[PDB]
């Protein structure tokens, strides 16, 4: 019942086709040097570079409306810091140590899918659990999760297993935000599947 207006309808619609998936997928021209974007955007692979955290942005920045996408991140390919969220065009996408790079600054917001913590302007210590509460605490992030960006309310939230888990972050209005992840695992293959948009004020 905390879902963005329009999300249920957006998710029930026929999914965007492979062309749309590529168009809204990872950007080969906007990722870490240590990442390769494959299949025209459908997934990326992080090369096995030591002492590096590496990010990617989607090709398309969202300034309005409701957008959603599915991230597929194999359970065995997460390593010590696997973070899923969004970033402005200004967020850094590489650093020379293993860390929750996405969410470590003012330009990025991330959920640590290993630890369950939220990062925005955070170096890690003290970061809050999401979703809050006992159900939320025991939640495991399976291979697939949905990322939901509501630019009318200015929220980012997530869904697993058919259930929206609530807004994770507020304070996103008046930005242009891109799908983003940060990864540390050699040879991880992280997929993005765009699920579409509802551009109108109430979606």
């Amino acid at each position: 019942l905390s879902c963005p207006e329009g999300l249920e309808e957006l998710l029930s619609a026929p999914p965007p086709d492979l062309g749309a998936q590529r168009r809204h997928g990872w950007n080969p021209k906007d990722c870490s040097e240590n990442i390769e974007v494959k299949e025209g955007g459908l997934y990326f692979e992080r090369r096995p570079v030591a002492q590096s955290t590496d990010g990617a942005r989607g090709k398309r920045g969202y300034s309005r409306g409701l957008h959603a996408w599915e991230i597929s991140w194999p359970l065995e390919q997460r390593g010590t810091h696997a973070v899923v969220g969004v970033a402005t065009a200004l967020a850094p996408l590489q650093t020379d140590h293993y860390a929750a790079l996405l969410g470590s600054n003012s330009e990025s917001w991330g959920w640590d899918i290993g630890r369950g913590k939220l990062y925005h302007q955070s170096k890690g210590p003290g970061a809050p659990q999401y979703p809050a509460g006992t159900q939320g605490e025991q939640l495991e992030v399976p291979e697939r999760l949905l990322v939901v960006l509501d630019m009318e309310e200015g929220t980012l939230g997530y869904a697993i297993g058919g259930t929206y888990l609530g807004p994770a972050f507020r304070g996103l209005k008046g930005r242009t935000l891109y799908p983003a992840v940060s990864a540390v695992w050699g040879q991880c293959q992280v997929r993005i599947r765009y699920l579409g948009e509802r551009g109108s004020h109430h979606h």
Partner: peptide
């Protein structure tokens, strides 16, 4: 390259 994160 053989480290904790498969590098």
């Amino acid at each position: 390259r053989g480290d904790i994160n498969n590098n």
